[PDB]
Amino acid sequence: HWGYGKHNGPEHWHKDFPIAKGERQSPVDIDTHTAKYDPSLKPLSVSYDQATSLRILNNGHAFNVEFDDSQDKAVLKGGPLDGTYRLIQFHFHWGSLDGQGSEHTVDKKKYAAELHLVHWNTKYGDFGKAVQQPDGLAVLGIFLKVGSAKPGLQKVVDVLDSIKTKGKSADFTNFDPRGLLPESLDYWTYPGSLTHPPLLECVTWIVLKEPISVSSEQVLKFRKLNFNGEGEPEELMVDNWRPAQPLKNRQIKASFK
Ligand SMILES: [Zn+2]
């Protein structure tokens, strides 16, 4: 039902998912001049050396690069987090043109795209249990701008032709997500939600300050994907982002001065 089309997009989601108007919805605008440096926050610990990617899937709203999360391999720890969060998948949000695509914004600036690396809290045993808890997920968000190519993205780019339509997947082993990080891991953090239905309020957001650069050719391949299934009317997979939601009673904390 829900999507990013002309009649089922973010402004409609609240009908079926009333949590869309909840108290800790994502994404949000990050006001750089009211996010406060928090000296109690720690450097992120991104431990991806043993990551095992398995598969890439077009799910009709993005594509997910899926990992083996059946044991502690690729984990996120530290930062604002207590305990250990296992990497399950990453995906992107992007626009029809370079001036929109990100979910989070920075002083109202929209980036061309945003990468989400999704991790679940091992204290809850499985992902399905984790999403029912306020500290169940940690999502590392990384902005993309268009300029130079990102070498470590090309292997993703080049498989997209094989998963054009919803429900298609392809083997995708030995991909190293470290090639998608910027140089600095300085970040903002706040409590929020998943950004598409069911919009569960289970996420500690960790949004990196420094964007990565990808090329116009790389982004153009993203924009050739389809929301639709094989043989159905073609709807390009573009503008798969939810706009910023009210901050309400939340504070955005910065890891950096
Ligand atoms: Zn996302």
Side-chain angles (χ1 to χ4, degrees):
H1 40 317
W2 68 268
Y4 303 95
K6 293 202 152 232
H7 310 285
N8 66 357
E11 66 283 18
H12 296 275
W13 295 351
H14 67 98
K15 288 177 280 175
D16 278 359
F17 305 92
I19 200 169
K21 300 181 193 291
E23 298 301 302
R24 60 171 281 179
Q25 290 290 293
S26 295
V28 299
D29 184 54
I30 300 163
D31 182 341
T32 67
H33 323 90
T34 62
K36 199 180 185 205
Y37 171 58
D38 184 351
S40 81
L41 288 171
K42 302 165 188 186
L44 279 174
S45 174
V46 185
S47 297
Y48 287 172
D49 186 71
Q50 292 300 309
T52 292
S53 67
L54 294 169
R55 193 178 71 141
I56 191 174
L57 171 73
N58 181 332
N59 60 29
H61 45 97
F63 63 84
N64 289 179
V65 175
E66 298 169 350
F67 289 78
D68 175 13
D69 60 341
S70 71
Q71 72 185 131
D72 302 348
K73 294 207 158 173
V75 301
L76 188 62
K77 309 173 68 168
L81 301 173
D82 292 312
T84 297
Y85 291 71
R86 281 204 190 144
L87 180 62
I88 178 169
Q89 53 96 342
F90 73 76
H91 60 275
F92 304 80
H93 307 269
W94 63 94
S96 51
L97 286 180
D98 299 348
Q100 59 187 217
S102 68
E103 296 207 306
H104 295 86
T105 57
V106 179
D107 300 327
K108 300 304 183 62
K109 176 190 177 65
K110 298 173 174 78
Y111 285 87
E114 186 174 329
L115 164 62
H116 290 161
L117 299 113
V118 180
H119 314 72
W120 59 270
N121 193 333
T122 66
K123 78 184 284 170
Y124 302 119
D126 69 60
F127 178 91
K129 286 286 195 287
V131 297
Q132 300 180 64
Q133 301 289 158
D135 57 354
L137 296 185
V139 182
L140 181 56
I142 307 179
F143 294 118
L144 280 61
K145 63 182 190 176
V146 177
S148 308
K150 190 67 164 176
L153 184 61
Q154 194 60 36
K155 288 182 181 198
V156 172
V157 169
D158 284 329
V159 78
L160 298 182
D161 75 299
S162 71
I163 59 152
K164 182 177 183 173
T165 53
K166 178 177 186 185
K168 294 198 71 184
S169 68
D171 300 318
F172 202 68
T173 52
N174 301 102
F175 179 78
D176 181 359
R178 293 178 290 191
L180 301 176
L181 300 175
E183 176 184 339
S184 177
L185 303 179
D186 290 348
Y187 65 86
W188 297 282
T189 183
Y190 75 96
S193 75
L194 287 169
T195 66
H196 68 258
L199 298 168
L200 295 176
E201 292 179 333
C202 62
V203 179
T204 303
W205 276 97
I206 300 165
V207 176
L208 299 189
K209 175 166 184 300
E210 184 183 20
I212 61 167
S213 290
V214 303
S215 64
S216 62
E217 295 87 354
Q218 289 179 319
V219 164
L220 290 164
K221 291 178 171 156
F222 282 56
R223 294 181 182 144
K224 296 190 184 184
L225 289 164
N226 285 186
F227 287 125
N228 53 279
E230 187 180 3
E232 292 171 5
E234 185 169 39
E235 295 176 26
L236 295 177
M237 184 180 282
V238 295
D239 299 315
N240 62 343
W241 49 279
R242 186 191 193 188
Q245 299 301 308
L247 191 58
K248 299 192 179 170
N249 192 44
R250 294 180 292 181
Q251 294 190 310
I252 303 178
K253 297 174 185 184
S255 72
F256 60 91
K257 193 58 200 179

